[PDB]
Copies of this chain bind each other. A is one copy, B any other.
């Protein structure tokens, strides 16, 4: 839950200090940038079944080796468990677009994922090819605002970098 709020409050709690004018000046940027990220949050919250259907079959159009026997996506009950996770990651993008900071992506979807995907033999390049499909399916005047699409694709790039 690394916000702009929880960063400057917990850093002021380590010195044992009152909130000073450097702390309040950081929250003034939260009343400047929140119009773009809450626009992109409500655009994702009303269109999410359309975009995780479009993302997940770009993974299996590229990586068609997964539908082989003995591989990962070999029966129907675990292809449905794959789109479960693309819906899980877009929900965490929508949470961190609300709080304005990478915390919901960090401690609920990333912090332990490399231990899990290796042990269950899940290819993390298939997760990248879904998340980096929606970053360049987006076109900035049609789908959201100009600065709403800046901060939306910037939270996808955190998800591409933490898996790659």
Contacts and interface: CB of A to CB of B under 8 A. Distances in A.
Nearest to A29: B29
A26 B11 contact: no
Number of copies: 3
A80 interface: no
Contacts of A3: 22
Contacts of A65: 63-65
Contacts of A27: 29
Contact of A8 (B20, B26, B64, B164): B26
Contacts of A29: 25-32
A101 interface: yes
A100 to B, nearest CB: 6
Nearest to A3: B22
Contacts of A28: 29, 32-33
A114 interface: yes
What are the 8 A-B residue pairs with the smallest beta carbon separation, nearest first? Answer: A29-B29, A22-B101, A28-B29, A26-B26, A25-B29, A4-B22, A20-B102, A4-B25
